Ligand binder design. Sequence first.
Ligand SMILES: [Fe+3]
Ligand SMILES: [Fe+3]
Lengths: 423, 423
Amino acid sequence: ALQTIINARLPGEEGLWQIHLQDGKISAIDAQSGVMPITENSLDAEQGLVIPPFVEPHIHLDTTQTAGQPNWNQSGTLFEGIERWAERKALLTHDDVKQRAWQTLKWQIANGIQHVRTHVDVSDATLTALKAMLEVKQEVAPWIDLQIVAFPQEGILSYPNGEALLEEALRLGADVVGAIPHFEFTREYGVESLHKTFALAQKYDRLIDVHCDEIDDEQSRFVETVAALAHHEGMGARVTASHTTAMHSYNGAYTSRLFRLLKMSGINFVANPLVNIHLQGRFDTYPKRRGITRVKEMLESGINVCFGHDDVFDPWYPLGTANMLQVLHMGLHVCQLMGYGQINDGLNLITHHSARTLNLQDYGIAAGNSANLIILPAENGFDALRRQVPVRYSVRGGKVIASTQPAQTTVYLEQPEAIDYKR
Amino acid sequence: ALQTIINARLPGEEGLWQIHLQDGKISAIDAQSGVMPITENSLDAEQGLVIPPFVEPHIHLDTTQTAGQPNWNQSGTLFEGIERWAERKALLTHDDVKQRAWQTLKWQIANGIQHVRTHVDVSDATLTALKAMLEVKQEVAPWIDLQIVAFPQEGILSYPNGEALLEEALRLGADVVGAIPHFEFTREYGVESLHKTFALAQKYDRLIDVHCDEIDDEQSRFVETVAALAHHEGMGARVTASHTTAMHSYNGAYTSRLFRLLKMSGINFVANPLVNIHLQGRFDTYPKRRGITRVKEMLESGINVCFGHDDVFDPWYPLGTANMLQVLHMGLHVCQLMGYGQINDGLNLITHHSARTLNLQDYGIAAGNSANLIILPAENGFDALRRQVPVRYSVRGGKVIASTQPAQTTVYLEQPEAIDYKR
Ligand SMILES: [Fe+3]
Ligand SMILES: [Fe+3]
């Protein structure tokens, strides 16, 4: 029965704020001139930062939690990962997918993530993972709004009945149409697959999220077709180009020309730091490229870009706890967004920009919006990122759905001293 | 009236073997536990290696034996070669083509080659060389099965009546449909020419062999269309991509993606070491690229690749004696297949893999097959390659069609000593 969040700091705002709640929504937001006393029905942010929930714009819940089953990827390569996944085929069932997806979703709830977009491989005639994920979506709805992308992993034109299966996935309820041009047999199939993807999105009124140019090939430019088609249909807001790691290898002249179109099209971009730094640059000896898309330049140009985890504890990425501040930390380093303001503003890459990517209509600490917000025990984005703080409280519909009692560290010098890693 | 080949060594097999012959075919193959005595009607391999005939998967018999006529290519360049060829136009007649083709074919018979695929330029309204080659094919049949590729040297779409002439060549009997995408005026003509090539091959039930991406251009990727179209039509076995020298210059990420399709398509690849090392890398100063396709990687991936001589004694390559062990020697060096096993297994690149490229149905030392085989005076492939041994005997239909008495070398030290270059 929470009525107020008090003593809240807000990004880009001075001072402390009080967030009033009513009927599961934010009724008003008022500045405070000092610290407010706690009381029944008040959740004290304790001068910590309050932001609208973290978002996971790109993850594969159908493959999550499978690392080491039955064997571990020892080389760490994409190739071996594919083989290790194949060895687990006998365990891939409806219940298995639901159990693993739920395990990661619980970690996400614990990490203040209330919006998740999962890709699901639909290059499977039985659509086993998709059927399982559609049930998971309904089951987790009280805690996470889950979007499902029908992802034609083996291609649309390069896989038997690929287009038919992609459309079947949409008819079953998938929220987003996926594609993977650079994986199609030819450049022509790649371009044609995008026309088919856009046609399906318009036919069913769905969003689009393409695994776009995820390859260190300076000639992989499917992103220009994604942006051009979006501009032509006037649907930029509903379109996302995931990865675009090839952009890391483009010459500057083409990239400059392309950026005009990217801005005009209004499409969204997702970079996946943890996985990109790991899987890109694998064909280089030395020097080795970083392989993340042009995040810094997109921000400078006002192009919406955000960060996803992509994989959690699977053959393609053995690590992760589904933590967005960890994803952000990696991205700030690899993209060299290390100035104070760049780091502080970093939270945008895992909150607001990701909400835009998911085309969310009810997101942000604003009057009238649902009371969905989280509290970080930190002074600002810089502090939260530097100390990799947990989510103190996650509030959804005005109710607490997760909480973390912080770790307590003590050093025993001449006298015991508490250490909080602040100066 | 040969009834048996005795004391034969076979690649990948231990010991000695006896090959029984009946009615021009191999009736049975039995292992020996020791050396068998010679006798009437037995051809003694003398513990030498017996293999199914050498194959020439790619040669231009229409241009062979013309070097220095009327003038020599002094720079050695492709450009000058084209000019030197043009200066000989008055001599290019029906009889001239037949005489020169036969001269090289005799060298091939002497070198144990019983299967040859020759390309013939059909960008000539009079189709002079093609008509001559069709007669040569009939004439040489007792010794060599000759396949003729209708090769549109000046392009299909970029030359007047190019497509009509290509089809006319097929209606006259050419066995294989050729193409040369990278030489077409535009990338679009290149791709379209391949669709036309595949349509003709299906219309006439012929094989396909494309002069594919023979250029140091990292953007020349016609090979993906060749492989995709073959996969689509389910005809990989009947398709060959010759040269693919551009692949030597591709970035690794694209090449890795492409390899999946190359393996799935089942198409064949021909590298032409002697000519590729000579004509590729000509626009580099220093360092200079080798320019041969990814032979080592194809072998590692189980993709069928083999070696051709391409040109013999002409403006584009002034050397050669049409010797496949010499072609192999160059390829092993340039492709760095220099480990013992890689060298020993090298014979596959000029025998079995080439037979697959030609879609041969009667090839190999196996019961039921025609008795077509050759005997090398060497212990194994490594030995034959190292010593560049001649073909001791070439047997076709159970009859000897060629034989070489080995050279005899003596050094006169304190006493005369025979030298055989074995340790
Ligand atoms: Fe992904
Ligand atoms: Fe050729």
